Symmetry: D2
Subunit: 369 residues, 4 copies
């Protein structure tokens, strides 16, 4: 018997505020200059945002408008009052951005545990955090505020997901809300049960789930208030929830291998599982200084393969071009597509269509096998 | 298969931030062992921004934070605009205000004397040595910023070849890369480390050695760049070899389970391996809201156990007290010991004695088994 | 015919926010270490405060608490909501002050002024402007007009004929306020009644003709957001407001954020004190006193009086009496005015001179008897 | 006997670094968008610059380039090394300026001129600025290459019955390289290359400098400078920028403000009026006052104080100014041609009486008009 826990946070969590600002700046630059080199870090703490780093760009007007891009993103997140702890219209914004082959091993992962081919704990955690935001923004639960966190504990027996053990949903809200009479039943109804009905897991036993809504009580203020956040401090939330395997994504243009190769490996892994070649797979790519193409491409199927792993590797080599320039080309990465990736996970998204989540190589793999 | 891990010196801008965050933590703990600390650092060209939240009676230490920051930067070795950054003259801004569901992991493997995976162990040995030869004046033209990368070739899980070593280091502008830097780094850093390690079977006879493959490296640190606390988690832990339960360490007092429980799991795993109970082990601890002690303690021995895994788990239960208060007590964590952890890895350190690296539970485990 | 205009601002004006923060930090340090050396500058802009400079102090706890001192001062000013443009509880605060523990004079010319135009011996335009800005704040803080918000500005224009103040020409009062307030039906009459008319009754000028004053309340209209919002402020940017409203010459240098060892501050204070006592002693109707210092000498090398023809005693005799009665060595000024005390935050708005609401050492008429007996 | 002291500082003084950054930003914006609204404040302290305020502008490329403009200004000032206390290439720069695209005041302002110097400025400030400019010049031209940017000058003149009789004291404090012997090298070099050359330039017909007390770095070594261990802000040298304390000020700093700010353009216009009045021979010295009212473009008052030195009835002088000058703010901006990138040079060495650059408000182009109108 094993327990596995993963978590997700809303776009209002102070670390995720930074990821989104970083990727909003990236997007704004790429929209006007697809060739922009961007490495932009964001810090938030009580009442202030500090955006720093380096860019090379011809998008001078977009660069000039970064301060406005910052405020607009914070307002979109929903921080529009001191009463909520943070206000995009009135907060401090300081900008300190300058403007004028490698050895590596990267991993990607997929598993037939959910429709989106993600491990169950992180998949359910992201579905819950996204729904928590949706019910606030659509006016379903209009007393909600932006900050929030979800945690999912699944009980396993011999690698089989048998029970939904614990779900924790913590959300910011207006001060006059009764936690027991209002928040608890509303969250259970509009967020948890709605998500569980969506997922429609064929075998998971949710009959005795321990559900904890705001277990630490009132959550009136949030975000940077009495706290701090930074870009790239939610890597495990951004990826596989600790289920599978460095370098953060947000604020980096796709020339950063930490981002584009991680994306490429997810794409490969997902297409391999969807091709029915394995129930679960970790794909590793090894790069060497002075070689564009990988020097190694390895598959681990954990005994779940339906073909010899060496043939899976051969098929991947034939179907995918894992040179960095080819990855960027094939995944059409030189576009302002990054702000949405900055909360609710980079992998297994059910609400937006991302290039590295497309099952557009399934038939190619099958034919190549 | 090929496996690569990386380490960076204390001069890398992200590591400057980790060190500043933990230097502030240490200063507060030295005067008030019960301090609550969550301190994040940002660096970019010519400036440091330290933010977060503290609860402390160490008001004198809090007041002296700006001086603690400058002293740390000078110790790192940034003491001139010619090097790209100067602790004595740079900008310093301070904006610090003044259970849970969880799964944490720890890992150990009999691949090195320090019981760490070989790629990260060698990368950290190399980065420490690179700093050592600079500070003691052996190679006096070296400057603080640097990076090491180690690629090991494996055949059926046996480390058979040292495939590639990359050492990149900052240096004075007048240095001949081929006549001076290359042989000096080979002799004083790489070869001494290899001789120190004295691996009984690893073949180093055809290692590809690259010293500053991208050429001159004169300016470094935050210059024309940016760093943040907690952006080198893979370097801080197992180099990608073993999974992380998520969460950065630096700037956080021991009450933060992300830090202390990760340390505890390393401690458990290392003692299990040292006790000969397995060649390699991942230990997992599961916590539930409302319970002090873990609701789960799981061992994965990858087929390398010398006793039944359930018996190992039983022994760990008897020997270790994994309540948060007990971990803090048993590892004597309420002390100023953290600044040294902020570069060269938190795990597997040879150069400093860390409580979670002690083999002080080996005999207890052997008797309990 | 002549017109003279001076202005004042409330403690909510963004430059005045900075002056108050700077002197609030000064006061906190002096309270625990009276010998603290302090040169603290404050910047504000949308949503953020930046406090910078250098301090030498043993008041380490006070130094650690500076961020709390900053937030408390902003809340006292009245900025407690994003709806007002600024919130002390939730705004950004960054501290970049160099700090150390402890352990000749300059060439200078400093000026002080006084004039029998008002009870507080200040020029009429600045005196009235300060009384108005102070009353504006008062009626907000005491709940008389609770819809007011912190930021505000007053302007007073006086018409003179042959140097006599004959007419109150124009009064401008601009004030921040809640969004729903009717400018013509509520704000205008409330401000006239509770601010302008009360101040005029307080002053009770025996001869000034206020019968045709042009009164303008919020001439530009709605004033809902204020302070640093969509603006910026810095310490030391309201020097004319802080002193004589342009009526009298300045020897340069701002006051706030500076401990009393800064001659720009303490000597300007000493010269006011001298001028005020000279006028109160009946020695002149108006006077500018100038002190000259030389490097290497503590005591002044020159002490000059300009009475603009209004003296009742030979100016040389006035200078002689000042020389006997006053000790204008910087060290003596500090000791005699008892300046090493947390007394500065109140000076940071509504003027450093002529204050009718607080007792300041350099405003004390405690040297009149000495001058009369010395002459 | 009376003593009057004024001071000036070099472009390297931390407050002047701020004024220059603020006006360099203004210039860059005006160059591409002459209608830009600019209110830009600069702060400096150890190792960092913070530029804040608000701009309305179409000059988006110039706005994007503000950080580079800041660094280039600091480098031109001469701060290029941690060894000097500050380096424009490596220092921190943060920009907190609000930015948008385009979509009456009660006042009394003063201007002043006096026939005490060729530039029609009071002698103490005129000499102080001449000295601070020459101090910078001998560093930049390599005459005294060991000098560094920061410095300050003070001039004390002794007066007898309003006549400047003696140069009493000169204080020159300057940043310098660490190895320099203050007493044996700096002191005589400064006496020779800075003070004596300035006195030769001025060639004052009566001022007796024979026993001037000269103090070079009286407080000792000055190796580090600028923001190092200090702080500066825009608009904190108002008396240096204007008349050195000799003449009254109707409030408000100049730098970082576009010409629509009456604090700047009206102060400039008043200097212009006053200078032309003296140069027209209508008085030896004059303070001109302009009064403005809310809701009227043209002044509601224009007054002259000639301090008994007039050669024509003060009321006639006031009438002549009324005919010759259009003191509506829009007219001032048009007639002085203010919507141009001309402001960075004004940010050190004084806005008035400049002998090294040509400023519109220093031109004697209304002298003939005044004589015809009088
Ligand atoms: Na003499």
């Amino acid at each position: 018997g094993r327990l596995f826990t993963s978590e997700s946070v809303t776009e209002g969590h102070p670390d995720k505020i930074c990821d989104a600002i970083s990727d909003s700046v990236l997007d704004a630059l790429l929209a006007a200059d697809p060739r922009s080199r961007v490495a932009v870090e964001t810090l938030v703490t009580t009442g202030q945002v500090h955006v720093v780093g380096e860019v090379t760009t011809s998008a001078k007007e977009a660069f000039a408008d970064i301060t406005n891009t910052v405020r607009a993103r914070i307002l979109e997140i929903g921080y529009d009052s001191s009463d909520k702890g943070f206000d995009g219209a009135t907060c401090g914004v300081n900008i300190g951005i300058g403007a004028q082959g490698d050895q590596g091993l990267m991993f990607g992962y997929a598993i037939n545990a959910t429709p989106e081919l993600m491990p169950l704990p992180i998949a359910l955690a992201h579905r819950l955090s996204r729904r928590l935001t949706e019910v606030r923004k659509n006016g379903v639960l209009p007393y909600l505020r932006p900050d929030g966190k979800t945690q999912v504990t699944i009980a396993y027996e011999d690698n089989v997901p048998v029970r939904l053990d614990t779900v924790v949903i913590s959300t910011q809200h207006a001060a006059d809300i009764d936690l027991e009479k209002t928040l608890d039943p509303d969250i259970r109804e509009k967020v948890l049960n709605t998500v569980l009905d969506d997922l429609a897991h064929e075998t998971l036993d949710a009959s005795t789930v321990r559900v904890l809504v705001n277990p630490t009580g009132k959550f009136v203020l949030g975000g940077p208030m009495g706290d701090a956040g930074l870009t790239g401090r939610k890597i495990i939330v951004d990826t596989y929830g600790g289920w599978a395997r460095g370098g953060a994504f947000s604020g980096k243009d796709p020339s950063k291998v930490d981002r584009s190769a991680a994306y490429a490996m997810r794409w490969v892994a997902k297409n391999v599982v969807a091709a029915g070649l394995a129930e679960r797979v970790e794909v590793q790519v090894a790069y060497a200084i002075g070689k564009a193409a990988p020097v190694g491409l390895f598959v681990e199927t954990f005994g779940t393969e339906t073909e010899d792993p060496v043939k899976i590797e051969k098929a991947i080599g034939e179907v995918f071009d894992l040179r960095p320039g080819a990855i960027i080309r094939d995944l059409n990465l030189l576009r302002p597509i990054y702000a949405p990736t900055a909360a609710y996970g980079h992998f297994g998204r059910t609400d937006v269509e991302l290039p590295w989540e497309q099952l557009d190589k399934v038939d190619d793999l099958k034919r190549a096998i």
